[PDB]
PDB file of C-alpha atoms and ligand atoms in Angstrom:
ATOM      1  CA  UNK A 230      56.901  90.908 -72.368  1.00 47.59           C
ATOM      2  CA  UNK A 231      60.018  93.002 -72.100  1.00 50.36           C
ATOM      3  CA  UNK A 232      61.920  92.151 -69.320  1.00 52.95           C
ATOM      4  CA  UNK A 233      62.388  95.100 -66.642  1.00 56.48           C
ATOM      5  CA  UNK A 234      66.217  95.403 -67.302  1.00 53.62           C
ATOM      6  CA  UNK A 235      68.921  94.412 -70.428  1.00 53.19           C
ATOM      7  CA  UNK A 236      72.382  93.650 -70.462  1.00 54.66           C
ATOM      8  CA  UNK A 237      73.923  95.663 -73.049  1.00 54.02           C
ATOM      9  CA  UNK A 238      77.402  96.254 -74.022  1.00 54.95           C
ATOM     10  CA  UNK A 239      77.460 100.146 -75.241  1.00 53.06           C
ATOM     11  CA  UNK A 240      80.138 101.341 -77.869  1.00 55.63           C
ATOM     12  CA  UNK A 241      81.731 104.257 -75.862  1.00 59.21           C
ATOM     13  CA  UNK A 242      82.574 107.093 -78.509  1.00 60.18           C
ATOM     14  CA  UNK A 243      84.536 110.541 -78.645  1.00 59.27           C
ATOM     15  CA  UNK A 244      82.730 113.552 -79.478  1.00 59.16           C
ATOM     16  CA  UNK A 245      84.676 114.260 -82.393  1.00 58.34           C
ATOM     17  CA  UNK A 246      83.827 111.209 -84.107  1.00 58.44           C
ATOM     18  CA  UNK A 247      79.830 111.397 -83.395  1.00 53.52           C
ATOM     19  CA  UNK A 248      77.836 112.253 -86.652  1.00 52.64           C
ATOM     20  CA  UNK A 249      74.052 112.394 -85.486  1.00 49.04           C
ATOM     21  CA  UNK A 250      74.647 114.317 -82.227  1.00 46.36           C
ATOM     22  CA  UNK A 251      71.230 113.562 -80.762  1.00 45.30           C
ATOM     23  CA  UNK A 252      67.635 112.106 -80.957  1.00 47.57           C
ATOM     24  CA  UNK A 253      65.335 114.424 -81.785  1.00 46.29           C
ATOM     25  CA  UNK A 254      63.435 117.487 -80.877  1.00 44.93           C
ATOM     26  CA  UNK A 255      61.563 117.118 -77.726  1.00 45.48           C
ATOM     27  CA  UNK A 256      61.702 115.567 -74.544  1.00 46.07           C
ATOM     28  CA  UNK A 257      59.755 112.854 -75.151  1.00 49.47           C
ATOM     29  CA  UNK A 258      61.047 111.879 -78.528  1.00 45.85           C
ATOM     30  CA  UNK A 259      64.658 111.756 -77.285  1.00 44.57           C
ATOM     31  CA  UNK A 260      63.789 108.944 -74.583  1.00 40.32           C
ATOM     32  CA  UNK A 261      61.338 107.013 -77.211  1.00 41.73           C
ATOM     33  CA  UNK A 262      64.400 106.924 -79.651  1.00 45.56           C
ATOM     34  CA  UNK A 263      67.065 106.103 -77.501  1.00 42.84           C
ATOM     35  CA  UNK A 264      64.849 103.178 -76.168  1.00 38.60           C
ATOM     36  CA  UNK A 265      64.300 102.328 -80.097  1.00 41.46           C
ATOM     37  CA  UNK A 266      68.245 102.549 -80.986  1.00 43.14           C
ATOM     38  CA  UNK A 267      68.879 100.784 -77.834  1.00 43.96           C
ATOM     39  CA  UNK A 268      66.495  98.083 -79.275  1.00 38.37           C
ATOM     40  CA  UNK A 269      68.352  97.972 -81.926  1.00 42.62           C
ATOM     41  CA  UNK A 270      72.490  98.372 -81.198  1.00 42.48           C
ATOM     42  CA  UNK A 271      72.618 101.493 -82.230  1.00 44.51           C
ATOM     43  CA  UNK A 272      73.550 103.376 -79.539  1.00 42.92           C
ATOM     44  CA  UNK A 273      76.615 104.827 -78.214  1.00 42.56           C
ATOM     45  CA  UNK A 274      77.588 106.579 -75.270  1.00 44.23           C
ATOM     46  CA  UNK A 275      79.539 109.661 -75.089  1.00 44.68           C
ATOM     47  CA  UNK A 276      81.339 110.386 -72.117  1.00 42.29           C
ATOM     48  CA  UNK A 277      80.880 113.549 -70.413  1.00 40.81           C
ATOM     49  CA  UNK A 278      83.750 116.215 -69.666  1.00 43.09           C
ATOM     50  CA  UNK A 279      84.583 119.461 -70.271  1.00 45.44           C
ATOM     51  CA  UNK A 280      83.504 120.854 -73.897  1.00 45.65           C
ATOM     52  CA  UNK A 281      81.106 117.518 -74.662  1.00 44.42           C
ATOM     53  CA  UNK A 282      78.135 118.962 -73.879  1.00 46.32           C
ATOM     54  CA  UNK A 283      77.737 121.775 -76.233  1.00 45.85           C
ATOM     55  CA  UNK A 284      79.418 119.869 -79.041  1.00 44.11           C
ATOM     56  CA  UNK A 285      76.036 117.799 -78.956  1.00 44.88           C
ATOM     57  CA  UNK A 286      72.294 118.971 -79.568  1.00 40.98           C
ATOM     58  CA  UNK A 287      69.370 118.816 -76.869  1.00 40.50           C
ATOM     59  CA  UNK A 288      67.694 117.611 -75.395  1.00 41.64           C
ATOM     60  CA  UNK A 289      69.961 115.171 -74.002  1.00 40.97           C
ATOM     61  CA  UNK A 290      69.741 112.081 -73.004  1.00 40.78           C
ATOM     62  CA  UNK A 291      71.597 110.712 -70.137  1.00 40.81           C
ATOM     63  CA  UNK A 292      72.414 107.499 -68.492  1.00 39.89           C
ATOM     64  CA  UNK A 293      72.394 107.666 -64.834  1.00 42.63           C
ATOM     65  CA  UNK A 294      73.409 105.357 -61.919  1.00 43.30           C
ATOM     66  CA  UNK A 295      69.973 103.702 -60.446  1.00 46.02           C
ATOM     67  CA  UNK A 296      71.830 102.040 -57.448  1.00 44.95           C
ATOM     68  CA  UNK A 297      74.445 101.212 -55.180  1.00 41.82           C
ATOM     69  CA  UNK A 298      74.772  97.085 -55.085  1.00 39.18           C
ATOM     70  CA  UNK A 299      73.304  95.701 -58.549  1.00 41.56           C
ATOM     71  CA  UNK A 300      76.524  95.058 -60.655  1.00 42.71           C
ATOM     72  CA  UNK A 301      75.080  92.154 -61.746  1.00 43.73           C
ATOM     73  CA  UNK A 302      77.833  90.030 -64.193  1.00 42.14           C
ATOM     74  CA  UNK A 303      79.674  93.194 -64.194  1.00 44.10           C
ATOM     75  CA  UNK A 304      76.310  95.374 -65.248  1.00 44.04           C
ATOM     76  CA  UNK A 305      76.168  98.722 -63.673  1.00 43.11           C
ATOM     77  CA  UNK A 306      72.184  99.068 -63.524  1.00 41.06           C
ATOM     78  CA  UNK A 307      71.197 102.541 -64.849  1.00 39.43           C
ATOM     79  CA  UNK A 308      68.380 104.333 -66.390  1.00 40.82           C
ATOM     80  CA  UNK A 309      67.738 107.480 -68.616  1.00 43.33           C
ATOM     81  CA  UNK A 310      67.082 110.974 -67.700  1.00 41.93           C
ATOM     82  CA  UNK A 311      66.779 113.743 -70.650  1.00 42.68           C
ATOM     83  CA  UNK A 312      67.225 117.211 -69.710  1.00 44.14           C
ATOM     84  CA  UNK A 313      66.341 120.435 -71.832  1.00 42.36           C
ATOM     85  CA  UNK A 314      67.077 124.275 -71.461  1.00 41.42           C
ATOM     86  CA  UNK A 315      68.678 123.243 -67.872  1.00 38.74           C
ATOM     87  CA  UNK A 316      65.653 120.900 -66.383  1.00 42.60           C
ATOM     88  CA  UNK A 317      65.887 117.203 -65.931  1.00 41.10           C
ATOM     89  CA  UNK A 318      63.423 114.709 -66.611  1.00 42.96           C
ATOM     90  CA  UNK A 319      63.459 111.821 -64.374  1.00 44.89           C
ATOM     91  CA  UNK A 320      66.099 112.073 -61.003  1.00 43.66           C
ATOM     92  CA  UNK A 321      68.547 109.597 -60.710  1.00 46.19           C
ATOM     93  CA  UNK A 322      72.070 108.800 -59.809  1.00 46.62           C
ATOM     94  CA  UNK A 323      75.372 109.693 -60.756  1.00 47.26           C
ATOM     95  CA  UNK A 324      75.940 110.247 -64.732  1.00 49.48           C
ATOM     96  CA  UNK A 325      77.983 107.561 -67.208  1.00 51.87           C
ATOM     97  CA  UNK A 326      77.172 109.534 -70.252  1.00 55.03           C
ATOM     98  CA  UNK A 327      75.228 110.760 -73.005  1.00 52.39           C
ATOM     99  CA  UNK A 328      73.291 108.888 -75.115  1.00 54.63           C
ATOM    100  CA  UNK A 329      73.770 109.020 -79.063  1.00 48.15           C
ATOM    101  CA  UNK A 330      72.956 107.422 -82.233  1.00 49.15           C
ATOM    102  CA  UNK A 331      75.674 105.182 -83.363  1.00 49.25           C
ATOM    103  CA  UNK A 332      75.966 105.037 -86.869  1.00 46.37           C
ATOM    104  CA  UNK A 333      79.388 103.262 -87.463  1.00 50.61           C
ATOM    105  CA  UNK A 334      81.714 105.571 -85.649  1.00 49.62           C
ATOM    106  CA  UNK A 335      84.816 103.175 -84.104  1.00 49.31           C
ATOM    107  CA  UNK A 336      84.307 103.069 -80.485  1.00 47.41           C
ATOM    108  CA  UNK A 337      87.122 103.529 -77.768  1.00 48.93           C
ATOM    109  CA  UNK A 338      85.835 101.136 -75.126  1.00 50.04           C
ATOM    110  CA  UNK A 339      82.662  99.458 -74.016  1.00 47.04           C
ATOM    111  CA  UNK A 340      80.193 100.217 -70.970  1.00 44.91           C
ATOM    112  CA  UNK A 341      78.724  97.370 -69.416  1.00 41.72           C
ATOM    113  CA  UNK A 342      75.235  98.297 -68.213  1.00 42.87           C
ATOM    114  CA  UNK A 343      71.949  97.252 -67.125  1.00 40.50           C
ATOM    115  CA  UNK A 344      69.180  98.912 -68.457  1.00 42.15           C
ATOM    116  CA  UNK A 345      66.208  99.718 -66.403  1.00 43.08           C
ATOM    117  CA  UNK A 346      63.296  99.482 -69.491  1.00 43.87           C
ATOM    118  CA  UNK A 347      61.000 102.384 -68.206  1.00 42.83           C
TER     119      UNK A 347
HETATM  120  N1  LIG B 451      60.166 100.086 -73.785  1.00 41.30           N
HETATM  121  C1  LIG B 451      61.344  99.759 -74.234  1.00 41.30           C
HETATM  122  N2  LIG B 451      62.417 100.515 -74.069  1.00 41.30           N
HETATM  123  C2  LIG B 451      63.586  99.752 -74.333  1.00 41.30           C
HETATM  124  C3  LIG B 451      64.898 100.140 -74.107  1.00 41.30           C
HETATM  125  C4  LIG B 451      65.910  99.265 -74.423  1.00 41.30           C
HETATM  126  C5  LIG B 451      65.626  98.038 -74.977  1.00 41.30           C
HETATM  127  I1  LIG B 451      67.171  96.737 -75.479  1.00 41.30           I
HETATM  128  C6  LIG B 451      64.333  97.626 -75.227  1.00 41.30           C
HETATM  129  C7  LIG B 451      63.305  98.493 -74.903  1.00 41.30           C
HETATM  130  S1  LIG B 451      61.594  98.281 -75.107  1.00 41.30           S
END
């Protein structure tokens, strides 16, 4: 009975800091844990500019704008999209970040989003 999207406060982190720098192997097993950790609280976000990208291990997964009015309570509504060797899985809006582990590292900020649950 999961609901079809989550309010969730993410713990925005810098690259540096990150000490799993990913979710597995495949395609599919990078979306199945980053549901899991999201589950969980133990996800961070990483955001994306120059040099993040290759200081973390694909595939990636990404969080990506679904659309252009739901803010709901301040909740940008997103969903995931993993890419690997250059090819996206899923197509979807305009990137917040990249999805990581979080294993303790101090965050910098919080990202308010709204999870789209498949
Ligand atoms: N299928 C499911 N994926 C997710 C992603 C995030 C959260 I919180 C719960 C679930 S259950």
């Amino acid at each position: 009975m999961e609901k079809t999207h989550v309010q969730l406060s993410l713990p925005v982190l810098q690259v540096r800091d990150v000490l799993v720098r990913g979710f597995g192997d495949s395609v599919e097993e990078v979306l199945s844990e980053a549901r899991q950790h999201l589950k969980d609280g133990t996800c961070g976000l990483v955001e994306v500019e120059k040099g993040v990208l290759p200081q973390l291990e694909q595939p990636y997964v990404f969080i990506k704008r679904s659309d252009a009015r739901t803010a709901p309570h301040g909740h940008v509504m997103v969903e995931l999209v993993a890419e690997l060797e250059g090819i996206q899985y899923g197509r979807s809006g305009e990137t917040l970040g990249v999805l990581v582990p979080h294993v303790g590292e101090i965050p910098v900020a919080y990202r308010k989003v709204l999870l789209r649950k498949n």
